Amino acid sequence: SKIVKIIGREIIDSRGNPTVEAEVHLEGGFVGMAAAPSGASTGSREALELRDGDKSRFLGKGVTKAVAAVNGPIAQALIGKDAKDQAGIDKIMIDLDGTENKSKFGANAILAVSLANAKAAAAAKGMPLYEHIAELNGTPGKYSMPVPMMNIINGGEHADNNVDIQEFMIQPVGAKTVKEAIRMGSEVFHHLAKVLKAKGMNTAVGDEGGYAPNLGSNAEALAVIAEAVKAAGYELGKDITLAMDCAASEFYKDGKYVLAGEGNKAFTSEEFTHFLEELTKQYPIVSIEDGLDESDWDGFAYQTKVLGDKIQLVGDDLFVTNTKILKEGIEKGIANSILIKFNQIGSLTETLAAIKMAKDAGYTAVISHRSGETEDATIADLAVGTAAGQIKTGSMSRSDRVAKYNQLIRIEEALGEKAPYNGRKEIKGQ
Amino acid sequence: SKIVKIIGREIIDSRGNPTVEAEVHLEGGFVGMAAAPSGASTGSREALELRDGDKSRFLGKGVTKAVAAVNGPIAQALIGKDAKDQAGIDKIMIDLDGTENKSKFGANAILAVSLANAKAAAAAKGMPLYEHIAELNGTPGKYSMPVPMMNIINGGEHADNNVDIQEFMIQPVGAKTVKEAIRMGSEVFHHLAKVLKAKGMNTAVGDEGGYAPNLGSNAEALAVIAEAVKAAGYELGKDITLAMDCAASEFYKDGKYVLAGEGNKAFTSEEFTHFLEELTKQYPIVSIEDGLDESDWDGFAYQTKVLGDKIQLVGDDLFVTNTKILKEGIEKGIANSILIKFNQIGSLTETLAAIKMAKDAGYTAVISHRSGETEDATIADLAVGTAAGQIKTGSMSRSDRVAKYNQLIRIEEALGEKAPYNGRKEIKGQ
């Protein structure tokens, strides 16, 4: 299925910042279109998106250079190639860029094309993207509907409140289908608004579409969530479990973890691990993301020994979707789960490798959104087509989040029994 | 191009509430897909969406009945019919519903199918929807890129502050393309966050992606915008003009207008308009929507007299996309503009009729989003394909808004100067 044209353009993301969109056209009029979510333009451990740094446009956040790479050197290299050969296409782009972190063309240029290409090839094969992804994965016809962890309450660097935890999420594990799980999320989301309004708190939303009300403590965040779940007619534990993202590095200093939402109590890493343990004993918290500083590998080894058999321990900042870091972590018994952010690696082929590494080690792969998203719903097809089993794609508001939920509804309608919603057992430790 | 299959489903909107999506499939395999944005399920003057009222699902806001209407009676009445005959398709559905306000099947059921059908027909003709809409309109090849009024600050019932006016919007009139207009909107939006942060105010967003900070007064609202516009390096009046929506029914008390945010001075129809007048001389506010209660026609006649030659006077609640009110309003000399919400009427054919009625009277037609949107960007194709000249589709955040800006970018890329961006002159009285 020969590529005949590739078009790149500067579009706008859910936070109002530019990002790259690509269209890939094939002989016969097949077309695929995808956009990159927002990422890092600096750092030493992840693939880098390319930004223009022109202060006279979009406050320096233009992506005209990345778009030019798509329209010029990338398009010229890929014209005439077989879009079905996903690994081949990704390899051409990675070699042409020539850097180890895609910083010449941008991870945003390369990813937009990688995804657009996969969609085009799927269309050339008369199949949806999730089905094509399963074939590319070597697992044809193997699907699952992912168990969503849905943002509900924001704290830390994502709020102006006295909650240390960066986010609390619900997981509708008692649902029989993802369609049901989405309805359960929606209902709790709306009841939470009611709870917060009765308290005179703000229900305007953050980047992920959840709330960041002026809560006075970590305990108060858990309490309002509990009240919302109850108000919606559900049971904590049985119907809905909790996941959290500590972003613990945000409150790490001088080798201690210091929590303002605990009245500025200080914890060593072993002590914080035991703080987390007690939380999991009092609330049905079954997943904990970045529960220690990324540099704290001795700490993470301990945390994994203490909690790992019963709790999902998710690396985000810890692994940054880097298989080199993940391999070492597996060797050292660090965590048991990884957040997959495809724009941190920058190609579909490499993304499939990362999920595979995780699964081969018995770690779970959690497909993730970014703070800057678009109406693109590629991560939905990715989660289904790899049977990843979990997804982290936002609260039940903002179409940058809800477009992914809608796509899971569509896919589940198409597949029915061919794509089971496995519920809590998808979660590491359950 | 005969209809072979039509698939209705319940998906989720940008606020987390159910709505209806429809796919229309044709002989040859052509497909179109669209979704209804959120409307009213009660009301006397507009088409009604059908909600289930089952309190055990989505707090009573299920759309399973409207979805069943799409899959059963609507689909069965349309199988074998010519999708190209938009008027004929729309007529079949309206006649079968058999009510005046589409309350049997729901405006949500009929509109989703109307729009999906138009999209499938465009595909069967090998053209984008905007091109097909121009053809349906009897105005082939006539386009423009709409001048957007972008939500930026919210007050009244749309916030918890001391601003009485429901929303302030910016219009990038000095741009030469819609792509440039979008970039200007984005820049001001980011500069506004900086300004609010600098005052220790909240930058979380509302339903339409704008801010609803704790401003003490209407004048404080206008001042922070002016400040953001200057910070962004534009000049108020030349580069960017202001639009507002008073939602004046909200402070209408026993025949008078009470604005708490301002001494509670309780104005008469007459004094409220001179009050607005005073704002328009102090700020380049060039458009005022619902500047008086929608029953206060004798008051609107006065406003249209005083401001009508200088200022765009937009009817939203005033007209609710209802040609009977519009017709009556034109003859009486009420307002000079109209917000077009295709779900308030319920079919694309009726929408085209409303736009044409306005146009024919020299009224401006402003194509509008709803509070509850989806990733669907039909209104972008609508605004262009009718050369309406103006769009109201949100702030520069949330993909439920920014998908529409993205689609406008794509369309302008394809059309170039065939779809001119006319700037300030689109606005009535400018």
Partner: peptide
């Protein structure tokens, strides 16, 4: 041949984004 060729993705963002799919065999 694609049953439903697009000149540009803007001609059907839904089909170009993979949110809706052509149904095979194609009814003719």
């Amino acid at each position: 041949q694609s049953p439903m060729p697009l000149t540009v993705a803007a001609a059907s963002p839904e089909l170009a984004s993979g949110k809706v799919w052509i149904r095979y065999p194609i009814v003719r």
